[PDB]
Amino acid sequence: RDFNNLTKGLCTINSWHIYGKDNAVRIGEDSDVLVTREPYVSCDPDECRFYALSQGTTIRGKHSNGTIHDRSQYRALISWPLSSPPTVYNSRVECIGWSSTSCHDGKTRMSICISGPNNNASAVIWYNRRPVTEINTWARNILRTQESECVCHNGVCPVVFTDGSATGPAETRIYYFKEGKILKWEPLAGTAKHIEECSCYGERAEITCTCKDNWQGSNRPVIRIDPVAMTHTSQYICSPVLTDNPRPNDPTVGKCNDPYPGNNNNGVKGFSYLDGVNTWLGRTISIASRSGYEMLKVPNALTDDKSKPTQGQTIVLNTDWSGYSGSFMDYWAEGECYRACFYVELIRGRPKEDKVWWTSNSIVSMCSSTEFLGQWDWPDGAKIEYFL
Amino acid sequence: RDFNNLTKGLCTINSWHIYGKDNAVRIGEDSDVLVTREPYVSCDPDECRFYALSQGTTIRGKHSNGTIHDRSQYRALISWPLSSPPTVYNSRVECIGWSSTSCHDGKTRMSICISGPNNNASAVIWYNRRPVTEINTWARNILRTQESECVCHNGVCPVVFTDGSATGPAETRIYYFKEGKILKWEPLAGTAKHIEECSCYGERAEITCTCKDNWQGSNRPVIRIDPVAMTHTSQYICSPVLTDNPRPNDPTVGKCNDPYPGNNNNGVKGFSYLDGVNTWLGRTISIASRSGYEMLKVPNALTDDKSKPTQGQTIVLNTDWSGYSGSFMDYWAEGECYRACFYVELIRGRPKEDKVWWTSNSIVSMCSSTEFLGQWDWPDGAKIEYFL
Amino acid sequence: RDFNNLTKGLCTINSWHIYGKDNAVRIGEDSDVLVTREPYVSCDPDECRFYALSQGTTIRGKHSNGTIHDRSQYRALISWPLSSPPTVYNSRVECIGWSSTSCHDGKTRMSICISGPNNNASAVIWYNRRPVTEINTWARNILRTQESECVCHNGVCPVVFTDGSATGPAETRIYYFKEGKILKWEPLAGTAKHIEECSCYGERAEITCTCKDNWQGSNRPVIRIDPVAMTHTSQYICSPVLTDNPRPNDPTVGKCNDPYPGNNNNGVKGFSYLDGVNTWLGRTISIASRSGYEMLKVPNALTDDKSKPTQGQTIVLNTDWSGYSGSFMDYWAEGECYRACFYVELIRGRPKEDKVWWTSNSIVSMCSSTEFLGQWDWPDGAKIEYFL
Amino acid sequence: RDFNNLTKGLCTINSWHIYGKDNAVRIGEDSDVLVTREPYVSCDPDECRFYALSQGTTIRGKHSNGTIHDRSQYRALISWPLSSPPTVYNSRVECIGWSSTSCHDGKTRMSICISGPNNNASAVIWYNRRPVTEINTWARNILRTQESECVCHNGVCPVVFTDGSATGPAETRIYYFKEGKILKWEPLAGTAKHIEECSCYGERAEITCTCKDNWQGSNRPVIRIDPVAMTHTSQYICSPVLTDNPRPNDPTVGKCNDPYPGNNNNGVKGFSYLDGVNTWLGRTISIASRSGYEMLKVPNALTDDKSKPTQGQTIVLNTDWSGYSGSFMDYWAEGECYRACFYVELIRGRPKEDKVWWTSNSIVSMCSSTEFLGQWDWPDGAKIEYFL
């Protein structure tokens, strides 16, 4: 109809309720489920769906062998109905590639897939299910993007890309697209020293992205975008409650404009909702691996370098595998505020579970409640032994 | 379009004709059919569908082992086309949880799923396929609901929940929702001493629910709701034709305001159509187990403590497994009256058939006919030996 | 929109072109295809679909054992997209039962399914996908109907039923339905001595049905219905080109008002297009079994007791299995005339191929061409050995 | 809405970006994927889809044995969602046959399938999913057509057919259809000596077809059609960059009106975009077999007998199997020009890989970019060893 405008602020997050869960690995042990990774969720005005990067093979299929690898010509961005698993028969291919993002602007959806060899990748921007724009690699070193939904305001949908090293300074760009066409792009500015896999959400005409500093930071970089002025700023979450993985133990004081040191060249895509006292941070429980997942209310985490938790909710037990996590919201729901939501990728198989030769995942997702709801843990649920 | 109003009375029930049957277990022996239990049927203005609580695994899959358990993080309310089986590929997830209800108000559908650990469950009310309201457990002991469709009148859809003990007094509440929001809730009143899994239907602006007294009664409790005044009453079916399971043998006189004794802490979800002489009761044939199923016309069963059958129809032979049963009607059919319908859950596997390690079911459903139709029996039809 | 009226006459049939073929048995050897029999084809104003009586199990499934049987509680009328096979995942259940008919009146579709034990069957008439009318058995001996599409005119859709003996006189009735309700019914009249499984088509406000006299006739009975006056007549195809199976060898002169003798208590559902010189008869090639299939142009077959073929087209070689055949036409196609179409059921398995324990079929269908097209034969195509 | 008119010219082709890839063989190793060959792509105003000739069996099924054969009664033209594989459950049958073409005219789609024995084949032209016209073989020797999409202009959709010898002169005809009806047909004229499997595209009210001279030419014949005047011309691509397979090595000067000699009675369906300096030719890398695939910019290839490449892009490595290739464009995209697209059939199995008994393929497709994008190679990706 008309382009959606981020006119509402976030609802008060007093807890998280269960939103969707596909139990993909459990079900796929005996049905035609595609092997995936790097999942996310994204809404259209009339439907919300699960998204991920297929590996072009079923879990039980013999081609599942070797799916620990990230980039191949057999990957594609696929979407499927909320809480169903990604099967061969219900999965819709949005585009071909090994890194993606996608978002609805209110009128139609823009999906972006990057493919190519390491030194010669290219992004192709689809709008209304047709290819419209193509961007060639600028640093010739794995052009890559969010791995979660982008956000639009009045037709303008900013997207963060990175090209270059994962263990040194790289070239991050913020592209402002409208109907799949490039209106403008900027180089990253601010104090964030390295940007990877941004998780974004929008409220009151501002887009907040919590990304990942693979190079040096255990605290997360944040990019705040003005989609009207088409400008942005960057910094790090000030809080001592560190949210990358692996990471050192929490200090008593964090860093606002520098990476918090202790772990180099590693991390995991993650997210946060930064809204004054209504601030909640997601993170793996383990400081060593992608294990467990919890949400912590840390009032003013973005700007207060001594902020610590005032409330929390466990999502996945530390005795269960987690993985990537990101933000999304249903911008087309009823009500006066946007309900914060997130998903957690539950990785199974390699490298942690190496008795099998594949790597896949299932999805669990939650949204906020103004109630103070009791908590449950939500594991993948599959028994690896069955796959042997 | 507009909210549906219960303006019609029930059609005269002279017999029952076959409405739907999915043969899920038979078919699932060699196809991707989800393991389920606690099924029901519910209509939208343009389609009627089968509903149930998936176990997040196929019947043939290795994860089917252990599906006798009621509550896990792998369950979800799913719906699928009438008479098809619940497959991985055609099942639509309505919400995540291990206890549910769902009903269309004429404009859109409300679905409710409760999830959580025993002492910390929570309900989330979805409307128009979006989460709108959340209710936290009030007694910290398995918050639970109908397991069959709710009913709406002018946008108001009452739902009965219970939280607390299954073998003592508990806290039952009647919530009146409109567009997924709570307009009001009451504690249970009347003479019903324990309420569980209510089966409801609406006619002439009144909603009748035949539930289950797990604690003491072999006769069924009944809750009659006024959706306009948002008030209700409760009692027991007076008739000596006892309809819970297990149960004692039928006496010559029943009880109108107290549970009829003889069996404690057990039962099965069931239903009835209470309409003066046009009254029909459903029940298992066996007084000891979920075996067989028959419909009995017992004129004035609700108010006459000596009422006995004047007609009957066998639905499932006593040599076949039955299970849960509930009511639903197509409130959007043509004609001057609402045609009473019901379903019977045909449970296969554990605990009765323990050579297999799973528990699932298929569905058979009937609706009333003004004709006096010949009868057939409708068993699940699967051979357990094939699964070995 | 509006009720369809049979305002056109048939197109000139100079040959038959391929219309649809599902290769169900071939495909089902390694995919989830339901076991069926008694198939047909029927069109809606915007789509034409394949129909059949499912056996409630896949071909490869263990429950396929015993599917030679005709009537069980696991059968249902299902429809699926033209030329696809009937799979567990794309098959839509129209109603439950072991004998059926279905037709679109221009506004919506009426489907009829009969179920029950032999001495207590009942038909339930569905309209707009809802049950509207029920008819109880009148002779208590396998109430049964067409097994192919009915035809409508201005909302009136006549249907032929038979109840009683298959090897003696029985009680055949012609019901005139409108919006699923009974406007009227007549007993069969005319000279046809036994009626079973009528195949019908409509043109110029008249409905012609070529049925089967199981009891005595090797020539086929014909019922011509006036859907406006709601009256009919009956006789036999006069031609010596006999079209039932099994049957004696063709004589030089046939019978117009009596069954042509030589074979008792047996036959196969079949059809014909009776249109003066534009007359074409379908029949198995073998006079002994359901083997082969050919179309023969026999000018004035209905009224000329010495009529013989003037042209022909082989559909299935005599070295291939055939089975039931019936008529249908797309009453919503463009043009000035109705294009005659038909299907042939290609039965595989029992009783002819008894190395397997199942009985199923695939479908081949043709429509007429005003051209004189070259001919091909169209067998099922499956290798039974593969199923062993 | 209205008939589409070829009002735009082609966009400038500076490179090719990835458009779609189904990884059918990889996925089909463990899921219900139909065996196919002779694929293509074609767009409707609201969706673009993959098309191919099914073999009426899954790859893993036992009936896959023998699928190297081209024509059987078990083949059919099927279409399915872009980039999904052709499965039993998502494939839509357009018509029955072993040679086809299909195109949308802006209002609805016309699909053509030819079936029959070698000496008695016939084409049936479907429009709006209904059979409208039939054409009988004229030379009684494998009536055949494009194997890729046709193109329409103001309702007129020209189609090229050939009937007769594949190793001598044959009878090629250009049919001009409108709403499935024949407006006119011509015999082939011009200098092309043999025509087979034309690949066509339209721009600025002209339709260009790059076909295949099976008999003598290693250079490709080209037919340019005027859909308004309903006339055409024919010649060969003048360029020395030879594009058939097998073929001799490239000379320094090609032939404009005669087949370039060196290889007789063999070839492969292929295509080209002939647009002055904006000219790009596709071809297998190997001069001996269907191996590899590359796109070469050869300015003025059609008219310049000494034209050589000025740029290029590898699509499939010479160490990977290729096969048929053809053109299509989304005539309903936004923008001022038509974006040239093409697909490459990646054949697996027989005759090159004879350890398996089947022959199938997957699809890769690209469209043009005005950017100068980095290149990747796109192989089928399946491991034949897995199928053993």
Ligand SMILES: *[C@@H]1O[C@H](CO)[C@@H](O[C@@H]2O[C@H](CO)[C@@H](O[C@@H]3O[C@H](CO[C@H]4O[C@H](CO)[C@@H](O)[C@H](O)[C@@H]4O)[C@@H](O)[C@H](O[C@H]4O[C@H](CO)[C@@H](O)[C@H](O)[C@@H]4O[C@H]4O[C@H](CO)[C@@H](O)[C@H](O)[C@@H]4O[C@H]4O[C@H](CO)[C@@H](O)[C@H](O)[C@@H]4O)[C@@H]3O)[C@H](O)[C@H]2NC(C)=O)[C@H](O)[C@H]1NC(C)=O
């Ligand atoms: C039914 O449901 C309800 C609803 O969920 C249940 O109630 C919930 O219970 C939760 C668990 O207790 C509770 O969650 C905790 O909240 C704490 C904050 O509240 C307390 O402090 C505030 C502020 O003073 C008070 O207002 C309030 O009254 C409380 O006293 C959080 O602080 C908790 O998180 C910390 O502990 C958990 C382990 O429980 C860690 O995993 C987590 O990371 C936090 O601790 C680490 O990080 C901090 C900050 O740097 C460190 O100081 C600390 O030492 C830890 O550091 C180590 O571990 C991390 C992670 O591994 C590592 O990185 C680091 O290096 C160190 O090694 C926790 O979030 C809910 O708030 C509460 N909800 C409500 C509404 O009440 C109820 O119990 C359920 N009922 C039943 C019967 O079960």
Ligand SMILES: *[C@@H]1O[C@H](CO)[C@@H](O[C@@H]2O[C@H](CO)[C@@H](O[C@@H]3O[C@H](CO[C@H]4O[C@H](CO)[C@@H](O)[C@H](O)[C@@H]4O)[C@@H](O)[C@H](O[C@H]4O[C@H](CO)[C@@H](O)[C@H](O)[C@@H]4O[C@H]4O[C@H](CO)[C@@H](O)[C@H](O)[C@@H]4O[C@H]4O[C@H](CO)[C@@H](O)[C@H](O)[C@@H]4O)[C@@H]3O)[C@H](O)[C@H]2NC(C)=O)[C@H](O)[C@H]1NC(C)=O
């Ligand atoms: C073709 O189709 C038609 C249509 O279906 C067939 O006709 C139907 O036939 C049915 C079976 O006969 C018949 O059903 C019965 O109806 C009885 C009522 O009708 C009779 O009584 C009235 C009132 O006097 C008369 O008007 C009428 O003329 C009849 O005489 C019911 O009473 C029957 O139910 C009871 O019996 C069945 C077993 O048949 C039990 O399973 C059932 O539970 C009922 O009996 C128990 O409960 C009562 C009440 O408390 C006890 O008194 C009794 O002892 C039983 O108690 C024991 O068992 C229960 C259950 O296990 C246990 O809990 C308890 O503790 C005890 O142990 C039955 O419903 C249809 O009405 C009739 N329909 C029509 C339209 O005619 C026709 O036969 C078919 N044709 C062919 C050829 O087959």
Ligand SMILES: *[C@@H]1O[C@H](CO)[C@@H](O[C@@H]2O[C@H](CO)[C@@H](O[C@@H]3O[C@H](CO[C@H]4O[C@H](CO)[C@@H](O)[C@H](O)[C@@H]4O)[C@@H](O)[C@H](O[C@H]4O[C@H](CO)[C@@H](O)[C@H](O)[C@@H]4O[C@H]4O[C@H](CO)[C@@H](O)[C@H](O)[C@@H]4O[C@H]4O[C@H](CO)[C@@H](O)[C@H](O)[C@@H]4O)[C@@H]3O)[C@H](O)[C@H]2NC(C)=O)[C@H](O)[C@H]1NC(C)=O
């Ligand atoms: C390319 O395609 C075209 C198009 O299809 C091919 O041409 C077609 O060729 C067909 C086969 O020849 C042909 O079909 C036959 O048509 C005959 C009628 O035409 C002839 O007679 C008329 C009338 O005189 C002439 O005008 C005309 O010129 C011809 O001379 C039919 O009579 C044929 O059917 C009979 O024979 C077949 C076997 O071929 C039987 O299966 C069939 O049942 C018919 O015969 C039985 O029944 C009759 C009637 O009672 C008996 O008299 C006779 O003895 C048979 O009876 C026995 O068998 C039956 C069945 O088993 C049994 O019940 C009974 O008891 C007995 O045991 C046949 O239909 C097409 O018309 C023709 N089409 C066109 C447009 O030309 C062309 O050949 C193909 N090209 C190539 C290269 O292959």
Ligand SMILES: *[C@@H]1O[C@H](CO)[C@@H](O[C@@H]2O[C@H](CO)[C@@H](O[C@@H]3O[C@H](CO[C@H]4O[C@H](CO)[C@@H](O)[C@H](O)[C@@H]4O)[C@@H](O)[C@H](O[C@H]4O[C@H](CO)[C@@H](O)[C@H](O)[C@@H]4O[C@H]4O[C@H](CO)[C@@H](O)[C@H](O)[C@@H]4O[C@H]4O[C@H](CO)[C@@H](O)[C@H](O)[C@@H]4O)[C@@H]3O)[C@H](O)[C@H]2NC(C)=O)[C@H](O)[C@H]1NC(C)=O
């Ligand atoms: C990142 O991405 C970019 C973008 O893709 C990469 O850059 C691309 O690199 C490509 C590979 O180098 C390049 O493709 C080549 O383009 C050549 C034309 O450009 C050159 O010539 C022009 C004209 O002078 C100059 O303007 C320009 O500056 C260049 O110098 C083509 O000529 C190439 O094709 C020929 O070679 C390939 C092998 O590479 C053959 O397979 C192909 O068939 C062509 O050669 C055969 O045919 C010709 C013509 O008849 C014969 O003369 C020749 O001998 C060959 O003949 C034999 O082989 C054939 C086929 O088997 C057989 O039939 C025959 O009988 C003989 O046996 C090639 O197309 C892109 O244009 C370039 N793109 C851009 C935008 O720059 C970049 O490298 C990537 N980066 C990294 C780090 O990898």
Ligand SMILES: *[C@@H]1O[C@H](CO)[C@@H](O[C@@H]2O[C@H](CO)[C@@H](O)[C@H](O)[C@H]2NC(C)=O)[C@H](O)[C@H]1NC(C)=O
């Ligand atoms: C989001 O904001 C823009 C205004 O920036 C709205 O766009 C106006 O919409 C009306 C109706 O479409 C037009 O007549 C105005 O000219 C539009 N645009 C501009 C850019 O001025 C848009 O409608 C808003 N979206 C919603 C859902 O309200």
Ligand SMILES: *[C@@H]1O[C@H](CO)[C@@H](O[C@@H]2O[C@H](CO)[C@@H](O)[C@H](O)[C@H]2NC(C)=O)[C@H](O)[C@H]1NC(C)=O
């Ligand atoms: C059910 O009853 C309510 C009246 O209680 C009907 O609601 C009225 O509908 C008309 C048209 O929508 C409005 O103009 C009235 O104001 C509506 N409501 C009220 C609450 O007064 C409703 O239309 C009835 N439903 C149907 C199907 O007739």
Ligand SMILES: *[C@@H]1O[C@H](CO)[C@@H](O[C@@H]2O[C@H](CO)[C@@H](O)[C@H](O)[C@H]2NC(C)=O)[C@H](O)[C@H]1NC(C)=O
């Ligand atoms: C089939 O015939 C009936 C007439 O018998 C047509 O019905 C008339 O349709 C118009 C528009 O719906 C009404 O105003 C007339 O009263 C209708 N009916 C009768 C029974 O008189 C019907 O429209 C015809 N169908 C078609 C497709 O033309």
Ligand SMILES: *[C@@H]1O[C@H](CO)[C@@H](O[C@@H]2O[C@H](CO)[C@@H](O)[C@H](O)[C@H]2NC(C)=O)[C@H](O)[C@H]1NC(C)=O
């Ligand atoms: C393609 O061209 C034809 C003109 O040749 C357009 O057809 C005209 O369309 C308008 C509206 O439908 C009619 O009133 C004219 O009579 C139409 N036709 C002719 C043949 O004169 C057609 O609309 C054009 N297509 C598009 C998409 O613009």
Ligand SMILES: CCCN(C)C(=O)[C@@H]1OC(C(=O)O)=C[C@H](NC(=N)N)[C@H]1NC(C)=O
């Ligand atoms: C305190 C529980 C009382 N109660 C109603 C039961 O135990 C019911 O028993 C039965 C049962 O089949 O008897 C299954 C139900 N299972 C299910 N809905 N998943 C279960 N309810 C819950 C919520 O687990």
Ligand SMILES: CCCN(C)C(=O)[C@@H]1OC(C(=O)O)=C[C@H](NC(=N)N)[C@H]1NC(C)=O
């Ligand atoms: C008294 C029965 C006479 N009759 C028409 C038959 O026996 C038909 O025979 C055949 C048959 O293939 O010959 C199958 C039919 N099977 C089927 N429609 N399920 C069956 N009809 C019924 C209703 O069972």
Ligand SMILES: [Ca+2]
């Ligand atoms: Ca890091």
Ligand SMILES: [Ca+2]
């Ligand atoms: Ca009880």
Ligand SMILES: [Ca+2]
């Ligand atoms: Ca007979």
Ligand SMILES: [Ca+2]
């Ligand atoms: Ca050649």
